[PDB]
Design an enzyme around this catalytic site. Sequence first.
Site, PDB file in Angstrom:
ATOM      1  N   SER A 106      53.301  87.829  37.452  1.00  0.00           N
ATOM      2  CA  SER A 106      52.172  87.506  38.338  1.00  0.00           C
ATOM      3  C   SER A 106      52.294  88.097  39.745  1.00  0.00           C
ATOM      4  O   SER A 106      51.294  88.533  40.324  1.00  0.00           O
ATOM      5  CB  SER A 106      51.920  85.995  38.426  1.00  0.00           C
ATOM      6  OG  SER A 106      51.307  85.540  37.233  1.00  0.00           O
ATOM      7  N   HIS A 138      52.585  84.367  45.046  1.00  0.00           N
ATOM      8  CA  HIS A 138      51.456  85.251  44.730  1.00  0.00           C
ATOM      9  C   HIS A 138      50.931  85.979  45.972  1.00  0.00           C
ATOM     10  O   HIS A 138      50.604  87.168  45.925  1.00  0.00           O
ATOM     11  CB  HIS A 138      50.322  84.472  44.059  1.00  0.00           C
ATOM     12  CG  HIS A 138      50.673  83.956  42.700  1.00  0.00           C
ATOM     13  ND1 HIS A 138      50.026  82.886  42.117  1.00  0.00           N
ATOM     14  CD2 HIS A 138      51.609  84.357  41.808  1.00  0.00           C
ATOM     15  CE1 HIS A 138      50.550  82.652  40.927  1.00  0.00           C
ATOM     16  NE2 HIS A 138      51.517  83.528  40.718  1.00  0.00           N
TER      17      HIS A 138
HETATM   18  C1  L61 Z   1      50.146  84.764  37.257  1.00  0.00           C
HETATM   19  O1  L61 Z   1      49.391  84.766  38.246  1.00  0.00           O
HETATM   20  C2  L61 Z   1      49.843  83.901  36.075  1.00  0.00           C
HETATM   21  C3  L61 Z   1      48.372  83.951  35.826  1.00  0.00           C
HETATM   22  N1  L61 Z   1      48.011  85.343  35.748  1.00  0.00           N
HETATM   23  C4  L61 Z   1      46.600  85.600  35.966  1.00  0.00           C
HETATM   24  O2  L61 Z   1      45.882  85.901  35.027  1.00  0.00           O
HETATM   25  O3  L61 Z   1      46.290  86.258  37.163  1.00  0.00           O
HETATM   26  C5  L61 Z   1      45.554  87.381  36.965  1.00  0.00           C
HETATM   27  C6  L61 Z   1      44.936  87.789  38.312  1.00  0.00           C
HETATM   28  C7  L61 Z   1      44.408  89.098  38.052  1.00  0.00           C
HETATM   29  C8  L61 Z   1      46.033  87.795  39.313  1.00  0.00           C
HETATM   30  C9  L61 Z   1      48.091  83.215  34.555  1.00  0.00           C
HETATM   31  C10 L61 Z   1      46.966  83.446  33.782  1.00  0.00           C
HETATM   32  C11 L61 Z   1      46.731  82.737  32.604  1.00  0.00           C
HETATM   33  C12 L61 Z   1      47.654  81.770  32.193  1.00  0.00           C
HETATM   34  C13 L61 Z   1      48.781  81.522  32.949  1.00  0.00           C
HETATM   35  C14 L61 Z   1      49.001  82.231  34.124  1.00  0.00           C
HETATM   36 CL    CL Z   2      52.651  82.509  37.925  1.00  0.00          CL
END
Ligand code: L61
Ligand code: CL
EC number: 3.4.21.105
Length: 178
Positions: free
Chosen positions: A110, A162
């Site tokens: 992430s 993040h």
């Molecule tokens: C990390 O941020 C985990 C998120 N990821 C997410 O999809 O962010 C995408 C944006 C483009 C930053 C996540 C998504 C789904 C399930 C768990 C965690």
């Molecule tokens: Cl995360």
Amino acid sequence: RAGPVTWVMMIACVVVFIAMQILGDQEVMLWLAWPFDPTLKFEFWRYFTHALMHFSLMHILFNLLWWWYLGGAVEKRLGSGKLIVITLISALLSGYVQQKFSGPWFGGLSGVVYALMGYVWLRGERDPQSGIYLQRGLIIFALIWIVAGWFDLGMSMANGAHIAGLAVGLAMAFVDSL
Ligand SMILES: *C(=O)C[C@@H](NC(=O)OCC(C)C)c1ccccc1
Ligand SMILES: [Cl-]
Ligand SMILES: [Cl-]
Ligand SMILES: [Cl-]
């Protein structure tokens, strides 16, 4: 097709995710997590390898989708080296911030994905002639996932990590658009 860095990262994440199914999450974390004991501070892969672990289908699916698209575009138009550096820096800084506020038990791409999104967006915004930019439709979906994380609509890393990830991408796009 996805370039070598884009590809190898995807594979590595898949391979690690499989290991987590077979051995359980905690046992894989034992080998790959950010140093969680002073006797581990010199196992240097750990400052990076946390980015390879994911904890649910959604986590890895959405992460790898953004990685494939953003990472793949950056690799193709700007080269492998660029993607490598964005990845190393964002993984280190977001991992640092994450452990600082919440301890060393976390994982996922992430932080890296926040960096790439920030990088691609700001780059296109400040320098169209680069060829790199984040489509209006994708800005919207990116914003929606950022909101999901901000207000907890259950993720490994916290908002701070993040943001740390995003800051790296903005910083590098800013540097590049000079
Ligand atoms: C990390 O941020 C985990 C998120 N990821 C997410 O999809 O962010 C995408 C944006 C483009 C930053 C996540 C998504 C789904 C399930 C768990 C965690
Ligand atoms: Cl995360
Ligand atoms: Cl592909
Ligand atoms: Cl460049």
